[PDB]
């Protein structure tokens, strides 16, 4: 079990850790989060009480180093930082634990929610989508735009999701225009899976990461990326049976976890109606179709 200590909490802030969140008051004696499960990526995220604009946060894996949060009163945010001195870090964490100034990652034993949302998400892949190579953790916020959004403007602060575009030479073989547009199997299996992602695990890892950025920061380009990656599978006649079975499970936990009140902005009516009722895979997402029908029947 690992720890992310905080230097202090000088400003009043809602702190998220994965799917959990806590209100911290201005100068409340709060010194961080303990008992973080090893084995998973995590995201620690922030919404200032005085500006419910700009949710921002840090993707990290505790196996890759010792990380702490410190408020920067010049840039006006909670910054993740790495402590290279192992003994200094253990000594700081032991003091704060002894003084019980830390919240405990509140995992229920039965509860596989975080594993099911992050199954294929790997910190090494996050760092290729979010380029800041001097840090082992990744900063995301509400406003960061995607490489594909920048084409249609600061490249350093962009989300480098794999560009998917159904009306592109990449997606459409010369002389297979109608076939490749109506059945995207070519684009899914040869171009994206074999060509770019190498395997379905990396494809699902990007899909899952795009969803979480959409849900936790209301990142609009992430949402576009999540929908595009779902639609490319649903719109392919030929998908490995294992990918379909795993996609149903992935989407089921995403829909389960979505705040009920955010369905109107985070879910694209056209993509979901097409995927569940019109597409080649209309009959292949039993779990996803049952939770969508019982939880968001208005959308459909």
């Amino acid at each position: 079990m690992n720890t992310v200590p905080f230097t202090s909490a000088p400003i009043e802030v809602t702190i998220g850790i994965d799917q959990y969140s806590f209100n911290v008051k201005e100068n409340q004696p709060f010194h961080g989060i303990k008992d973080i499960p090893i084995g998973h990526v995590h995201v620690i995220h922030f919404q200032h009480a005085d500006n419910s604009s700009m949710r921002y946060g840090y993707w990290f894996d505790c196996r890759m180093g010792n990380f702490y949060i410190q408020y920067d009163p010049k840039d006006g945010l909670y910054k993740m930082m790495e402590e290279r001195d192992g003994a200094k870090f253990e000594n700081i964490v032991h003091n704060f634990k002894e003084r019980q100034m830390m919240v405990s990652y509140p995992k229920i034993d039965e509860d596989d929610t975080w594993y099911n949302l992050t199954e294929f998400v790997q910190m090494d892949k996050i760092r290729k989508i979010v380029r800041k190579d001097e840090n082992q953790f990744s900063y995301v916020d509400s406003s960061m735009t995607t490489v594909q959004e920048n084409e249609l403007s600061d490249p350093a602060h962009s989300l480098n999701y794999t560009v998917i575009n159904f009306k592109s030479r990449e997606a459409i073989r010369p002389g297979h225009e109608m076939e490749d547009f109506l059945d995207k199997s070519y684009y899914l299996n040869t171009v994206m899976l074999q060509g770019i992602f190498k395997n379905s695990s990396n494809y699902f890892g990007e899909l899952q990461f795009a969803f979480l950025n959409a849900m936790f920061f209301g990142n609009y380009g992430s949402s576009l990326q999540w929908h595009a990656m779902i639609e490319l599978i649903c719109s392919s006649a030929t998908v490995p049976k294992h990918m379909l079975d795993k996609l149903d499970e992935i989407l089921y936990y995403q829909i389960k976890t979505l705040p009920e009140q955010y369905s109107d902005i985070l879910l694209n009516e056209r993509v979901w109606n097409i995927c569940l009722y019109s597409s080649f895979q209309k009959n292949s997402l039993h779990n996803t179709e049952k939770i969508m029908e019982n939880k968001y029947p208005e959308l459909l």
Partner: protein, 237 residues
């Protein structure tokens, strides 16, 4: 974006553009089978591809053989249309290629956009105009060449005959749309108006009769009368 009443003169400017109409590409007669079920028999079709400025008509004849052993023909028709339009642009020298293609039906946008990905600078547009180009098969000489075709064939016409010698494109296009609108609303009456006087003939190299400026005004009047009547009848007004 969409072409409408507000941006009408753009059709007659010096940017090469083409209208594509796919409404006569896939044509069937519906009949009873011996067992008293219904079946379709495809008949020859055409793509109506028109330069509204010059009147050059690229009539791509669609022979019934293109449908043999194909499924979902109404969907394939849209993609076949896009493939033939794409092949036509690629066949034209660079300085003759259109800067815009305007499709008369929105269902042609994605099929044409996907076939023209090689031409990112050619704008594919819809229109809000209700253009009567479906009535092109009421022009006797176009109908004759489509029905006689034994193979895929491209035939070139000027749908304005020699009008541009005496009138502007704007006026030529308005005459054409009034003639096609008439033919679409009441084919028999429209064709009676056009041929009643046997002293005004159609030249071998023309589609329409050789009317003087005065006789065109009379004809144009008779087509407007035909269209308003049929409208009163349609709508009990």
């Amino acid at each position: 974006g969409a072409m409408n009443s507000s941006n009408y003169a753009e059709l007659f400017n010096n940017d090469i553009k083409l209208f594509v109409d796919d409404t006569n590409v896939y044509r069937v007669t519906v009949h009873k089978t011996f067992e008293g079920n219904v079946a379709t028999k495809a008949i020859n079709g055409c793509i109506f591809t028109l330069n509204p400025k010059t009147g050059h008509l690229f009539l791509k004849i669609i022979h019934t053989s293109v449908w043999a052993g194909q499924k979902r023909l109404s969907q394939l028709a849209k993609w076949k249309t896009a493939e033939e339009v794409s092949a036509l642009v690629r066949s034209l020298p660079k300085e003759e290629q259109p800067k815009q293609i305007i499709v008369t039906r929105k269902a042609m946008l994605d099929p044409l956009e996907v076939h023209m990905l090689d031409f990112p600078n050619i704008a594919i547009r819809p229109t809000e105009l209700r253009l009567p180009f479906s009535a092109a098969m009421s022009i006797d000489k176009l109908s004759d060449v489509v029905m006689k075709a034994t193979e895929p064939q491209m035939v070139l016409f000027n749908i304005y005959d020699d009008w541009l010698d005496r009138i502007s494109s704007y006026t030529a296009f308005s005459r054409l749309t009034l003639l096609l609108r008439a033919l679409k609303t009441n084919e028999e009456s429209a064709k009676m108006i056009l041929l009643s006087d046997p002293t005004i003939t159609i030249k071998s190299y023309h589609l329409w009769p050789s009317f003087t400026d005065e006789q065109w005004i009379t004809i144009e009047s008779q087509m407007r009368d035909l269209i308003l009547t049929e409208y009163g009848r349609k709508y009990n007004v």
